[PDB]
Amino acid sequence: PVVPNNEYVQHFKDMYAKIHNANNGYFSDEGIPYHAVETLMVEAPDYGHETTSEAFSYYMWLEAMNAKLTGDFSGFKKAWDVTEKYIIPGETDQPSASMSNYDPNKPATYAAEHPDPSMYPSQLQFGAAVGKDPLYNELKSTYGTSQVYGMHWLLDVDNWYGFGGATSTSPVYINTFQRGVQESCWETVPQPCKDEMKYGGRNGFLDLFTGDSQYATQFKYTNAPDADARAVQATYYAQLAAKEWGVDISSYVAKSTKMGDFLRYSFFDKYFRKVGNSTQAGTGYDSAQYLLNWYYAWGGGISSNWSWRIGSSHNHFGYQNPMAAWILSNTSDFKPKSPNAATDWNNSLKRQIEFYQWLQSAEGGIAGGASNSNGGSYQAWPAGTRTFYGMGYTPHPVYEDPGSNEWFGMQAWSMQRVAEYYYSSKDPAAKSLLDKWAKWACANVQFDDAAKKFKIPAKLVWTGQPDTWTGSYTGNSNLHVKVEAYGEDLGVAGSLSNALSYYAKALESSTDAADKVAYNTAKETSRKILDYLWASYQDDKGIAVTETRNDFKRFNQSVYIPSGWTGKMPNGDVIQSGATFLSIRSKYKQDPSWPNVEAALANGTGVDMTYHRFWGQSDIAIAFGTYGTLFTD
Numbered sequence: 242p243v244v245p246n247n248e249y250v251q252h253f254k255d256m257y258a259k260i261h262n263a264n265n266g267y268f269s270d271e272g273i274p275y276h277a278v279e280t281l282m283v284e285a286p287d288y289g290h291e292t293t294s295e296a297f298s299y300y301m302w303l304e305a306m307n308a309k310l311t312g313d314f315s316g317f318k319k320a321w322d323v324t325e326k327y328i329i330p331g332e333t334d335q336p337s338a339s340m341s342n343y344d345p346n347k348p349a350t351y352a353a354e355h356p357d358p359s360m361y362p363s364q365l366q367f368g369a370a371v372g373k374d375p376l377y378n379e380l381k382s383t384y385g386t387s388q389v390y391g392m393h394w395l396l397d398v399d400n401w402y403g404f405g406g407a408t409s410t411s412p413v414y415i416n417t418f419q420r421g422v423q424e425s426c427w428e429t430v431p432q433p434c435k436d437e438m439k440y441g442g443r444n445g446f447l448d449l450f451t452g453d454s455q456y457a458t459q460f461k462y463t464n465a466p467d468a469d470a471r472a473v474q475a476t477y478y479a480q481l482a483a484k485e486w487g488v489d490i491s492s493y494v495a496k497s498t499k500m501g502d503f504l505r506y507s508f509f510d511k512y513f514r515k516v517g518n519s520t521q522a523g524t525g526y527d528s529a530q531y532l533l534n535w536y537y538a539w540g541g542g543i544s545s546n547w548s549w550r551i552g553s554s555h556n557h558f559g560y561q562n563p564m565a566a567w568i569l570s571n572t573s574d575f576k577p578k579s580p581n582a583a584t585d586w587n588n589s590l591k592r593q594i595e596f597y598q599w600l601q602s603a604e605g606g607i608a609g610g611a612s613n614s615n616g617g618s619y620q621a622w623p624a625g626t627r628t629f630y631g632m633g634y635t636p637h638p639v640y641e642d643p644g645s646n647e648w649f650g651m652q653a654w655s656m657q658r659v660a661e662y663y664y665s666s667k668d669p670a671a672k673s674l675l676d677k678w679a680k681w682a683c684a685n686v687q688f689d690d691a692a693k694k695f696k697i698p699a700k701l702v703w704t705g706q707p708d709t710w711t712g713s714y715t716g717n718s719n720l721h722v723k724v725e726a727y728g729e730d731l732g733v734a735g736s737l738s739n740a741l742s743y744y745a746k747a748l749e750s751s752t753d754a755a756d757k758v759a760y761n762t763a764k765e766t767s768r769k770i771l772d773y774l775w776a777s778y779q780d781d782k783g784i785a786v787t788e789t790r791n792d793f794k795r796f797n798q799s800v801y802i803p804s805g806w807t808g809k810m811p812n813g814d815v816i817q818s819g820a821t822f823l824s825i826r827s828k829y830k831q832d833p834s835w836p837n838v839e840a841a842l843a844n845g846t847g848v849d850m851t852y853h854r855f856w857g858q859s860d861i862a863i864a865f866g867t868y869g870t871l872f873t874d
C-alpha cells in the first residue's frame with residue numbers, strides 16, 4: 242500500500258509527534274486528552290484540564306488519519322479503549338437497575354426552560370403532556386440492556402473540582418449548564434453527574450435547577466450529538482484505511498455503530514412532543530425532528546430504581562453531520578444492529594441536507610437553526626415565524642450569551658462534514674450549498690502574502706430570516722450575515738482548510754468551466770492556509786498564536802443563587818447570594834496564569850493567552866493529512 246510522500250503528509254506526521262510527545266502535556270495519566278494544554282481556560286468547558294466528548298472524537302479522528310498514513314492502528318484502538326472506559330458511563334455510573342425501570346410511555350416529567358437564571362429552579366409539572374419514546378424497546382431488544390451507549394459531554398479529568406474526593410485525580414463526570422438561554426459558561430454552578438448530596442447544599446446541587454417536593458440521590462448525563470457523530474465519521478475513515486492496509490478493526494466499527502444507534506435520541510423533541518404541533522404529546526416518530534439536536538440526556542436513581550430520558554427541541558446547523566448520517570445509513574460496514582436504525586439515519590441524512598439549504602443566507606454563511614419549543618416552554622410562535630418542518634427559525638439556538646451562532650467555527654466544522662459527505666457520495670443536493678458557501682468563505686479569508694499570515698472571520702452578526710422551507714432553496718434574500726471581526730483562530734483555520742480540500746477534490750471530476758475556477762480557488766486557498774500555518778505559526782507544542790480574551794473580565798461575573806440557599810464546593814468555597822464565577826472556583830487563583838489575569842483585570846485590559854487546544858491542534862494536523870492524501874501533486 243503506497244502511501245503519499247509530500248510535505249503535507251510530513252507536516253501531519255510532525256504535528257502527530259508533537260501531540261503525542263510527553264513533554265507537551267496533551268494527555269492525562271489515563272491517556273485522556275485535555276481540552277487544552279493550558280489550564281486557565283474558559284469558553285465551553287470552564288477549566289483547561291477538563292475534557293469533552295468532542296476531544297475524544299478528535300482523538301479518534303487524529304489516530305484514524307495516522308493509521309491511514311502509517312498503517313499502525315494501535316493508537317486508534319487506544320483512543321476507543323480510553324473513550325469506552327472513561328467518558329461512556331459504566332455500571333457504577335448508570336446503574337442497570339434504574340435504567341431497566343424506565344417507562345417509555347412516561348419518559349420524563351415536563352419542566353419549563355426560562356429566559357433568565359434567576360427563574361430557577363424550574364418546577365416539575367407532573368400533569369403536563371409528555372409523549373412516547375419509540376427507541377427504547379428496540380435498543381433494549383437489540384443490545385440486551387437498558388443502559389445507554391453514548392458519551393457524556395464533560396469530564397473532570399484530574400478531579401480539579403474535588404467532586405471525586407480530597408485525594409483522587411481519577412476522572413469525574415461533571416456538568417455545568419443547567420439554567421437556560423441566559424446562563425453563560427461564567428454563570429453556571431458546576432455539579433457532579435452523580436449527585437449523592439455529599440457536596441453543595443442540603444439537597445446537593447439538585448434544587449438549584451429543578452423544583453420538587455423531595456430529592457433523592459441520582460445520576461444524570463448529557464450527550465453532545467455533534468461529538469458522537471464525529472466519532473462515527475472518524476471510525477469510518479479508520480475503516481477505509483483498515484481495508485486499504487488489510488487490518489481488522491471490526492469490533493471498533495461495532496463500537497461506533499452502537500454509539501450511532503443510540504445517537505438516534507438526538508432526533509427527538511425534548512419531551513417527545515409532536516413536531517410542529519408541540520402542545521401535543523407524541524405517539525412515537527411524530528416527535529422525530531430528524532436532525533442532530535443540541536443534546537439528549539438521561540438519568541435516574543442511585544438510592545432507588547427509576548429513570549428518565551429527554552431529547553432536545555433545539556437544533557443548530559453547526560451540529561449536523563451528513564457524513565456520519567450517510568455512514569450509518571448507506572454503507573454496509575456501519576449498518577447498526579437495530580432493525581430501524583439505517584432507515585432512521587437515511588431520513589435524517591435527507592433532512593439534514595435540506596436543513597443546511599434552508600439556513601443558507603444571501604451571502605452564503607449558514608444561519609443558526611430551528612426549534613420545536615419556542616422559549617423552551619412550547620410557547621406559541623409569533624405570526625410570521627419562518628419554519629422548517631414545523632420548527633420555528635432561531636438565529637441563535639439554545640444560547641444567547643453570546644449567541645450560539647456568533648462563532649465562525651460552526652461554519653467550518655459543520656461544512657467540512659458536508660464537504661466530506663459530498664466528496665464521498667457526490668449527492669447533487671449538496672453542490673450548490675457548498676458552492677455558495679465556499680465562495681463566501683474564500684471571500685473572507687484575508688491573506689498577508691508578504692508576512693505569510695492570514696485572518697479568518699471570528700464573530701458573525703445575523704439579521705433577517707429565511708423563507709419557510711417548501712422543498713427547494715430560495716436564495717433567502719432577506720437573511721443576512723456580516724463578518725463583524727476577523728482573527729487568527731488557527732484550529733478553525735485548519736477546519737476551513739479541511740472543508741475546502743474536500744470541496745475542491747469533489748469538484749475535481751467536473752468539466753464545467755465555473756467548477757474548474759471554483760476548484761482552483763478552494764484548493765489554492767486551502768493550500769495557502771496550510772503553508773502559512775506551517776511557515777509562520779509553529780511553536781514548541783504545536784501550531785499556535787496569541788489571542789486576546791476580553792471576556793475574561795467575567796471572572797467576576799455574578800452567579801445567581803436563590804435567596805436563602807447556601808452550600809459549599811468540595812474545597813470549601815462558600816455558595817450563596819453574591820457568588821461569582823471566581824468565588825466558587827478559588828483554585829483558579831492558584832493557577833500559574835492567574836497573576837497575569839488579575840493584573841489585566843486590574844488595569845481593565847483584556848487577557849492575552851496562547852492556547853494549544855487538543856481539537857484545534859488535531860484539526861490542523863488532520864487538515865495537513867487531508868490535503869496530503871487528496872492531492873498527490
Ligand SMILES: OC[C@H]1O[C@@H](O[C@H]2[C@H](O)[C@@H](O)[C@H](O[C@H]3[C@H](O)[C@@H](O)[C@H](O[C@H]4[C@H](O)[C@@H](O)[C@H](O[C@H]5[C@H](O)[C@@H](O)[C@H](O)O[C@@H]5CO)O[C@@H]4CO)O[C@@H]3CO)O[C@@H]2CO)[C@H](O)[C@@H](O)[C@@H]1O
Nearest residue numbers: 285349350351352394418421451461463464465536538549
Ligand atoms: O430529579 C428528580 C426528578 O427528575 C426528573 O427529571 C428532570 C431532571 O430532574 C432534570 O435534571 C432534567 O433536566 C434537564 C434540563 O431540562 C435541560 O434543559 C438540561 O440541559 C442542558 C444540559 O444539562 C447540559 O449538559 C447542556 O450542555 C451542552 C453545552 O451547552 C454545550 O456547550 C456542550 O457542547 O454540549 C452540552 C450538551 O451535552 O445544556 C443543556 C441545555 O442548556 O439538562 C437537564 C438535565 O441535565 O429534566 C428532567 C425531566 O424534565 C424525573 O422526570 C422525575 O421522575 C424525578 O423525580
Ligand SMILES: OC[C@H]1O[C@@H](O[C@H]2[C@H](O)[C@@H](O)[C@H](O)O[C@@H]2CO)[C@H](O)[C@@H](O)[C@@H]1O
Nearest residue numbers: 284285286293295648650730732733854
Ligand atoms: O461551543 C462551540 C465550541 O466553542 C469553542 O470555543 C470557541 C468559542 O466559541 C469562541 O467564543 C472563542 O472565541 O473561540 C473558542 C475556541 O476557538 C470550544 O473550544 C469548543 O469546545 C466548543 O465546541
Ligand SMILES: [Ca+2]
Nearest residue numbers: 398399410411
Ligand atoms: Ca487523572
Ligand SMILES: [Ca+2]
Nearest residue numbers: 423424425642
Ligand atoms: Ca447571562
